[PDB]
Write a protein that binds this ligand. Structure first.
Ligand SMILES: C[C@H](C(=O)O)c1cccc(C(=O)c2ccccc2)c1
Ligand SMILES: C[C@H](C(=O)O)c1cccc(C(=O)c2ccccc2)c1
Ligand SMILES: C[C@H](C(=O)O)c1cccc(C(=O)c2ccccc2)c1
Ligand SMILES: CCCCCCCCC(=O)O
Length: 581
């Protein structure tokens, strides 16, 4: 391949090429308007077309990193708007691309995307290509680590909605509950992918491989070790490329893997039939979200190879990577009822037991009971899910969220109120999605979603560290994160936050808000109560938050709303300090 840009343009096609180039530049240049990005994509596409025609032509032989970085570094007002990226532009490759990746702005703090059914249908009918382009741009610049090919698929779902609802007489009623649905899927898809890039960033490639082996083995328990290894190998390279901004290489390798899985469908899973008779982007997405295959009847007993065999210490010392790899593969297949992080905890415990037993006088008598060391690792998560799902089913999403906000504020009262509310709210919505499932599917649903919310929190903590306890849980071990976070207790060294009257002061503006923005104001007050009175019992806090809810409802239903807030507000504040003693 003489011209790498021609190669990728030839393989991907103009439509997807333009999309992936837009995403690539949007994820870095988050402040630059859409119009300006379009002009940048047009110039890049023109260069690809020229190179596709004559591969010996000017600068066509240069690397994709060279061409990308050179182009990024020609953008108007770079030093002023993107001072960090501007410093990278001094450097040669591969140092320059490495600098770009380091200084990629994680949370840009742009306004929330509000659907405009009338204006967006108009823009869509006017020019749909540009309308889809704008969607890629808006999502890419808000989620800088979003997988290029996956975002193209979400753009198709976005398109499908707007083709279906714009013809309809009523638009708002048609689009909002679909665009609300699409926004959740974007948040989850973005979160899953941020965990993969975070895992690479924080724990390296060996951790991503072990996670993938565990997950694919659960999804494809029919597949043999050599098949899982092949998929994990190819998928890791895909994940590495997409996470490191190599969208063109990534889109191509992802398409190839999807083509391989579907060609070898019969020996991988019987659930891939639906996925494999679909178009390109829909196929890849379907495989990624595919239901776990039925357990094979012929899954082998593991006690013989991993507990009873007299030469395991020999197998461990000599054939280590294969032996531990085979264990993780085999143990994962037979436990779709376990979370990925639980399976990696069990693997780490298997290894640790072999280290100990194989250093001592009679190893076989020692490691014979290795499987029984897993029992505690399975019960701790199973109990917390049973316990939290009982609470959720009793009190509902709102009070469950409030329960979690109190729990975490007490664990980490140094963390900002918005973050505490966001995390407690998110893990509340986990209760809503997961607790209503069959009891066996709860733990994986819960602890896998917990991994997404904890990764979120750990990314915010990189931006603004507040707690050494949090830094340790976030950086020490991927497998041990949730346990480490669960282990945290109320820091007895913490100084109760100085009481600001203004903090618990409410006005009539609260009454016009939708129900969830109302909740957030009160949930923000709950966090502030725990911050001022952290030794207050969970029951004391439930009482006071009740008084705040009663007060808001009373004054929002008043003749003079502002006179009610102004009169009753200070009284509620004063009595609450005494109630939380
Ligand atoms: C509007 C402009 C164009 O089309 O010149 C443009 C610039 C960049 C990306 C894209 C796209 O993603 C896209 C989406 C659907 C069809 C074709 C392109 C489109
Ligand atoms: C690095 C990244 C990728 O490898 O996916 C990427 C994204 C978009 C475009 C290009 C280019 O090769 C390019 C070509 C000409 C001008 C500007 C960029 C490269
Ligand atoms: C209802 C139940 C109880 O009190 O035994 C319970 C269990 C767990 C946590 C909490 C809370 O902290 C809480 C605080 C305010 C509102 C809602 C829940 C309450
Ligand atoms: C700083 C926020 C702490 C969040 C801990 C979440 C762990 C899950 C739990 O045990 O509830």
């Amino acid at each position: 391949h003489k011209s790498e840009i021609a190669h990728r343009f030839n393989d991907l096609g103009e439509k997807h090429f333009k999309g992936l180039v837009l995403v690539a530049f949007s994820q870095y240049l988050q402040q630059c308007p859409f119009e300006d990005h379009v002009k940048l994509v047009n110039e890049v596409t023109e260069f690809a077309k020229k190179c596709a025609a004559d591969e010996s032509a000017e600068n066509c032989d240069k690397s994709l990193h060279t061409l990308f970085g050179d182009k990024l570094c020609t953008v108007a007002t770079l030093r002023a708007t993107y001072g960090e990226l501007a410093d990278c532009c001094e450097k040669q490759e591969p140092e320059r691309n490495e600098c770009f990746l380091t200084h990629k702005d994680d949370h840009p703090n742009l306004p929330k995307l509000k659907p405009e059914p009338d204006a967006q249908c108009a823009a869509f009918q006017e020019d749909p290509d540009k309308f889809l382009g704008k969607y890629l741009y808006e999502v890419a610049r808000r989620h800088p680590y979003f997988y290029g090919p996956e975002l193209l698929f979400h753009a198709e779902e976005y398109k499908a909605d707007f083709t279906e609802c714009c013809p309809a007489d009523d638009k708002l009623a048609c689009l909002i509950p679909k665009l609300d649905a699409l926004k959740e899927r974007i948040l989850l898809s973005s979160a899953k992918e941020r965990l993969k890039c975070s895992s690479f960033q924080n724990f390296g490639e060996r951790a991503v491989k072990a996670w993938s082996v565990a997950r694919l083995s659960q999804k494809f328990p029919k597949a043999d070790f050599a098949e899982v290894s092949k998929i994990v190998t190819d998928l890791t390279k895909v994940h590495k490329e997409c996470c490191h901004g190599d969208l063109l290489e990534c889109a191509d390798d992802r398409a190839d893997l999807a083509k391989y899985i579907c060609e070898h469908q019969d020996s991988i899973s019987g659930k891939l039939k639906a996925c494999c008779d679909k178009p390109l982007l829909q196929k890849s997405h379907c495989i990624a979200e595919v239901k776990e295959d039925d357990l094979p009847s012929d899954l082998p007993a593991l006690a013989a190879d991993f507990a009873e065999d007299k030469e395991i210490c020999k197998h461990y010392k000599d054939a280590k990577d294969v032996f531990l790899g085979t264990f993780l593969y085999e143990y994962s297949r037979r436990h779709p009822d376990y979370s990925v992080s639980l399976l990696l905890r069990i693997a780490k415990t298997y290894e640790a037991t072999l280290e100990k037993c194989c250093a001592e006088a009679d190893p076989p008598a020692c490691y014979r009971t290795v499987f029984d060391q897993f029992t505690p690792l399975v019960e701790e998560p199973k109990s917390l899910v049973k316990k939290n799902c009982d609470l959720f089913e009793e009190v509902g999403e709102y009070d469950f969220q409030n329960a979690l906000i109190v729990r975490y504020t007490k664990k980490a009262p140094q963390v900002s109120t918005p973050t505490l509310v966001e995390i407690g709210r998110t893990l509340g919505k986990v209760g809503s999605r997961c607790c209503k499932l069959p009891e066996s599917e709860r733990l994986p649903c819960s602890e896998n979603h917990l991994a997404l919310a904890l990764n979120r929190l750990c990314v915010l903590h990189e931006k603004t560290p507040v707690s050494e306890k949090i830094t340790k849980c976030c950086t020490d071990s991927l497998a041990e994160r949730r346990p480490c976070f669960s282990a945290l207790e109320l820091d007895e060294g913490y100084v109760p936050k100085e009481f600001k009257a203004e903090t618990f002061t409410f006005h009539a503006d609260i009454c016009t808000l939708p129900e969830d923005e109302k909740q957030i104001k009160k949930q923000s007050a709950l966090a502030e109560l725990v911050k001022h009175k952290p030794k207050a019992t969970k029951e004391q806090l439930k009482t006071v938050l009740g008084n705040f809810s009663a007060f808001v409802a009373k004054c929002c239903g008043a003749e003079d709303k502002e006179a009610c807030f102004a009169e009753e507000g200070p009284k509620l504040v004063a009595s609450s300090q005494l109630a939380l003693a």
